[PDB]
């Protein structure tokens, strides 16, 4: 809904909105390679939020999305004048090199030593909401399972009592009631736990990060926090979305499904392909420069978005992306992004994975969409498949 600016040839102008539903009824990733097969260049404009720039090969996404000294991560969001001003936060907001001791502190304090006790708790909560379930013969998978883990495994890595679930719950639901609002209340259900950790440290990831340095100096109060938010959000719609679209998947591809519950050994490596067949997340970079790229002049504090959907599914860098396939040899995709602002809750999100397949597929390993309903699909920051329902014998 913006003027085409002088920059933009009308010859890269199409009609693209991340925000718009996927067409009833088109495969969500089938959805994308059409947009990235009708598109007369590598990268397209879109007059649809606050008007930018879309890497549509793959090369190109990874080059914006890993690129810093030309693609800043100091806005995100589309619209950039509300959406990526409203939610910029130091230090997801930070390049290279200042984002650097910050993604050391995530990176290790999100590794497979520290949340070594996490599996457990992902593993009694899994099993206590599937047997919750399993007698009634069906469940909304979103709203029933997907959203009833996250929060809960945050919870525990920063060590918060069970009580707050519910509020913190809420909050992370507003935030992504005014939004700096909600983030006051995230601030003062926070800080005083900081605090109180300050004065007696314990083994959880908020002590760990308040006896870690960054520039040789202790972390502030409000480093913390926004730590913390940005690792309880980065990690919910995500992990939500994810799981749906490997369950309703299963649910369909019922080869895939009576293979996986017929021998679990193969879960590590469905795993794998789940992750590379899946991508949701769409980030984008602001430009800080005057830039010569792609043939076209980006002014400086234009918007370009690089999404990670668009990586695994170019078929010019990619055999048969939409096949979902056990036997792959090769797996490269950048679900997790790529370059400093790599997802560092990537180990979380991989162990998640394996726990929710083995102790679905120990309890209900035979399932599907309830009627065999067609999917539907939304398109966002996170892209997701509407929440469906599953059914099983008994
Ligand atoms: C299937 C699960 C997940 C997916 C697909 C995913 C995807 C991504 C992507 C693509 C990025 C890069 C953003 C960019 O280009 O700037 C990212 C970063 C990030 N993720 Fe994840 N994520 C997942 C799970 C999680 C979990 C479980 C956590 C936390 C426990 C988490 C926390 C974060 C944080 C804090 C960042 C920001 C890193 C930085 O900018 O320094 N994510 N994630």
């Not at 909105?17 to 390679?33: A, C, K, M, N, T």
């Not at 050391?104 to 047997?131: C, F, M, Y």
């Not at 749906?244 to 019922?254: C, E, I, N, R, V």
Request: charged fraction near 30%.
């Amino acid at each position: 809904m913006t003027e085409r600016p002088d920059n933009v040839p009308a010859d890269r102008v199409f009609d693209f909105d991340i925000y718009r539903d996927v067409p009833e009824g088109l495969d969500f990733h089938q959805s994308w390679r059409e947009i990235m097969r009708q598109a007369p260049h590598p990268l397209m404009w879109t007059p649809h939020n606050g008007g930018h720039w879309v890497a549509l090969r793959s090369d190109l996404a990874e080059t914006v999305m890993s690129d810093f000294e030309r693609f800043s991560n100091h806005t995100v969001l589309v619209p950039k004048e509300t959406a990526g001003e409203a939610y910029r936060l130091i230090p997801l907001s930070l390049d290279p090199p200042e984002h650097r001791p910050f993604r050391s502190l995530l990176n290790e304090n999100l590794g497979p030593k520290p949340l070594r006790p996490i599996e457990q708790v992902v593993t009694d909560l899994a099993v206590s909401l599937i047997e919750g379930f399993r007698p009634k013969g069906r469940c909304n998978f979103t709203h029933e399972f997907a959203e009833q883990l996250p929060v809960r495994i945050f919870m525990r890595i920063v060590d918060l009592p069970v009580e707050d679930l519910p509020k913190l719950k809420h909050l992370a639901d507003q935030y992504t009631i005014p939004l700096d609002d909600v983030t006051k209340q995230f601030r003062e259900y926070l800080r005083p736990v900081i605090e109180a950790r300050r004065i007696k440290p314990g083994e959880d990831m908020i002590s760990r990060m308040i006896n870690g340095e960054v520039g040789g100096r202790p972390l502030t109060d409000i480093e913390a926090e926004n730590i913390c938010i940005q690792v309880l959000v980065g990690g919910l719609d995500t992990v939500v979305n994810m799981l749906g679209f490997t369950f309703s998947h299963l649910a369909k591809d019922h080869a895939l499904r009576r293979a996986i519950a017929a021998d679990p050994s193969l879960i590590d490596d469905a795993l794998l392909e789940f992750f590379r067949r899946f991508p949701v997340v769409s980030s984008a970079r602001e430009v800080l420069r005057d830039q010569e790229f792609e043939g076209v002049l980006l002014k400086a504090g234009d918007m370009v978005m690089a999404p990670t959907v668009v990586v695994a599914m170019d078929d010019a860098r990619n055999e048969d992306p939409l096949e979902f396939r056990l036997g792959r040899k090769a797996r490269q995709h950048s679900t997790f992004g790529k370059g400093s602002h790599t997802c560092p809750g990537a180990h979380l999100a991989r162990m998640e994975m394996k726990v929710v397949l083995r102790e679905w597929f120990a309890r209900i390993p035979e399932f599907r969409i309830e009627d065999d309903a067609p999917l539907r699909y939304s398109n966002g920051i996170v892209g997701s498949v509407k929440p469906f329902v599953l059914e099983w014998p008994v």
